[PDB]
């Protein structure tokens, strides 16, 4: 089907839904497929599926879904927030590979770790969704990105899958033959994350005191939540509440009080 | 804390002066003192004001090179290893950053005083306990950061020819140690393939230096290709199409970011070998074995490029088959094909492309091509037999079919009188019958194996031995051992006439050949026991059903 | 120890129940609970399946030693029980009840009844002991609250004065909570029920205390108050809220802890999500399918994924487990197995001694089932061998463990399983073995998620977009049918 004008802009699109089988290379193809729309036409554009960059189909612009995307994270801005398009695109890729592998994790009747894979999968889809809600400020995205790398490497470990690199902004950005030594540094620190992650998983896997120790040991700025509801007693006069802190051991007090005007019948003044 | 000032010293001072001042200071350390601490000092230095490279490089890197080279072999350096690795790490890491200025020559010097040095160091670190990976890193970074210009410049241009050949000994053996038993946990696919990349490039450069200084022009001392080709093959023998298959894009990944290394590796191999020229005859019986694992890689391109190499070596052997034949190639050729294709690595399209190329070769050359044609037919037969064999082997588990196919190929080999793999499969059969718990037929196989052997007191051949147990073994020792388990089978087979016959000849061989009268008595009294069993025991008559196949 | 414990059970089988309590007191004065606890409840060898039976039946001995005293009715005219509850709700309600009504009048007693049961949800305060005539459980609820008044006094009075603020429908009736909970937990445990020799699952978390179920009830009534405050539920849904809550408590029980403290941990762990978590996690499939695009494609996915499910069950069965031989109570080896051949046109089955390695692959005792000829699965009761049950030889739970495929065209392959999920396993395994539809609840249980996984991974391209059911209009293909740049 003639009249083909190419542009790299169009090489990456998807479909709205099932197709029709009217013609030969026009069969009722699947809903969401990153297809190779290499060239453009009046009524129907080319298509070379994700499953075969050579299988042919001349699909209509109408049935091209909301994707004129490219490898350029800049052009159509359906790559809404570039730079994080990397993280999310390999996020999708790894989720696809995880689904594939655990699909044959049935005879590996590891329903335990299988179900942790599903838990991580739901966690991952919702995390990515929040990222797509990229209205958030920068620190939240940073921390999310860090734990995303954590979970990805986690899964690749127990799944027997390869290590990723580049701690920041991409997990991959190393391959540029930047520095073999820096490459080793990243690999080693990440691997340390790996064994420390396995042992902290065994830690957080039976009891969860150590997590309290750690989280209260990073920063030590604490306050006391007086989660008061009601005073169960009755004095008859303006009984005044004075909480305070004292060490049974140091024989000395710690903080200062707060006056609370509680009323004369177990009610608040 | 002394270096902790240098960055701001520079801002109000002659950086060169500061550098040489630190040099004069540190060089004065009594070497019997505070080694790792002074190394840490050198690190804290090399981090800073070495960004101001263009003036202090030429005066520190000499000195720092000297200290590391002194650190090289002091025979007590095991904790020094980690610190020296940090120093190498950091010097190279700063030298590779792009905002430093012309550093090629300074590398060149670090090269010139540490290549074989750290190479020997890791050649010491071969124990898998320490931080090997650090030094492996420093190695690969040294040799990739540098340039071919440097090798050709002086690394190729070291001292006397014998010495440089010893250096090459060192490098290639240690590489071949690297390709096997990777020092990285194989999960570091990024890092692992990077290492493959850099090693490949280094091996290329060494290919040029070998070509340059070791052809027939250097007719002298020309073995190293043993080490070279072995290195090339062992390198070539991982990262195979299954590994890249594990995702569709996994293939595409290693292709895009690296290409497929195997192609160029094999190309270097083939044209290296072509340039070897009039001396390939020194290689056939050795190097046929290696070149199949490249021949058998599941790809098409280099396989097509490679196949002619067998023809080239066999026709070179025809230059030496002016006297005689090329069988002293094809025997071991066939043997190797047998081992590998039974290993589970062949392809039918492999033999198809084989056929095409071999037929090209035949339909080029004269009468020896007719010979090679009939031998190509032999090879074909061989293949499709192994192919059907294998495809049946591991699927049905129908021991009947397994026995049928293996004896089919045993019969074929018998026809082609290849006694060795013959024996191999005969023992496969005894194990197969054992797992079938069939004893008469297992004994029968054992016999037809044994009847090859004769009663000569000369241990004529060790080739007939299975590689399980051997000492001097005059053939009669093996024959009588065979008979021991054979008569054991015939016993447990509850069939006796053949057993008592074998007892007859075993007894006569004892009595008139070895005079081991205890064994005489043992076997003959057992023969008597078998006689009484013949009479006393019952023999059920198995019935014979005719099974047509249509 | 199996022998001796079953002899003890025998002593408990056909003795007058009062002498059951006499000998129970003998055991308690030797504290057989604790001595058994230290010896065999700490045995880490092959703990007998007969130990499974013994632990169950000893629990039942204790249970019936409570049953024979609980089924009878505590008369609501028991002036003795009037004094009993008088002092019990002294030591309970002595914060709203004066210490003076010990020397006080029955009139103050009735006033305290009406106030403290309008704060503990009872509808009548002229005949307060009406709710004491439904056994399960009757008196043992009063025993529960007695023993709690003895030991857990801190949280006890805390309950007493924490129910003392909500006079709306969020008020929780301790008396009515107690009766409801106690009877329905009795039923969940099936306390004091007849010998079921197929019950090989037991309750060590109560092999570790003498008033274990009493203190269990109190710790779970603190759980109760937590759950009431979890939903902030009214007393109109009192029955609704607490039925859901004890569904959750059944979940907590079925997690099967073997220690009291770990189950207290679980009392903490069961969040309000657990009340809705999985019970609504079955629904993401139907929200996915409510819109067409997921609904309208999924229907071609099943052969892939139903094939996966059935063939996974097949792969399970290829090794297969060891069923139990019918009524080998006379010291015959019960665990017979059946191997699914990798060819799957034949079966390999027989009975041997217990095999912790599972099945031994060997050409089994009788080693055939013609999958083509054998056709009909008598799913449960339809087995002619056990069609004669009345109600006593077989009850209406063994057929969820027992059934047959026919064989020989005449005879049945009677089946048994240790439990019922693997009953589902074997059922749909034999079900697929004929190319006929899957009939396991787990089948329709697990398609959802895997189907959900496939559809969610398939839609990775369709995030933050909108599609209707109506497809867009379709343009037309012009007749320039060859490309400018041809294919490839």
Author numbering:
A (entry chain B): 1 to 269
B (entry chain B): 819 to 1368
C (entry chain A): 240 to 727
Quote the passages of the study that discuss this structure, keeping the authors' original sentences.
The dedicator of cytokinesis (DOCK)/engulfment and cell motility (ELMO) complex serves as a guanine nucleotide exchange factor (GEF) for the GTPase Rac. RhoG, another GTPase, activates the ELMO-DOCK-Rac pathway during engulfment and migration. The DOCK-A (DOCK1/2/5) and DOCK-B (DOCK3/4) subfamilies specifically activate Rac and have an Src homology domain at their N-terminus; the Src homology domain is involved in autoinhibition and binding to engulfment and cell motility (ELMO) scaffold proteins. ELMO is structurally divided into two domains: an N-terminal domain (NTD), consisting of the Ras-binding (RBD), ELMO inhibitory (EID), and ELMO domains, and a C-terminal domain (CTD), consisting of the Pleckstrin homology (PH) domain and proline-rich region.
We initially determined the cryo-EM structure of the DOCK5/ELMO1 binary complex using human full-length DOCK5 (DOCK5FL, residues 1−1870) and ELMO1 (ELMO1FL, residues 1−727) proteins. We next analyzed a DOCK5FL/ELMO1FL sample crosslinked with bis(sulfosuccinimidyl)suberate (BS3), a widely used N-hydroxysuccinimide ester-based crosslinking agent, achieving a reconstruction at improved resolution (5.8 Å) that clearly showed the ELMO1NTD density with two-fold symmetry. To enhance local resolution, we symmetrically expanded and refined the particles, focusing on a single DOCK5/ELMO1 protomer and the dimerization component, which led to structure determination at 4.8 Å resolution. Model building and refinement of the DOCK5FL/ELMO1FL complex were completed, with the exception of the C-terminal region of DOCK5 (residues 1643−1870), which remained disordered. The structure of DOCK5/ELMO1 showed a closed conformation similar to that reported for DOCK2/ELMO1 (21). The α-solenoid of ELMO1NTD was clamped onto the DHR-2 domain of DOCK5, occluding the Rac1 binding site. This indicates that the DOCK1−5/ELMO1 complexes likely have autoinhibitory regulation in common. Despite the common closed conformation, a detailed structural comparison revealed that DOCK5/ELMO1 is more compact than DOCK2/ELMO1, with the two ELMO1 NTDs located closer to each other. A closer interaction was observed for DOCK5 than for DOCK2 at the ELMO1RBD-DHR-2 interface, between Glu36 and Asp39 in ELMO1 and His1545 in DOCK5. The C2 domain of DOCK5 interacted with the ELMO domain of ELMO1 in the apo state of DOCK5/ELMO1.
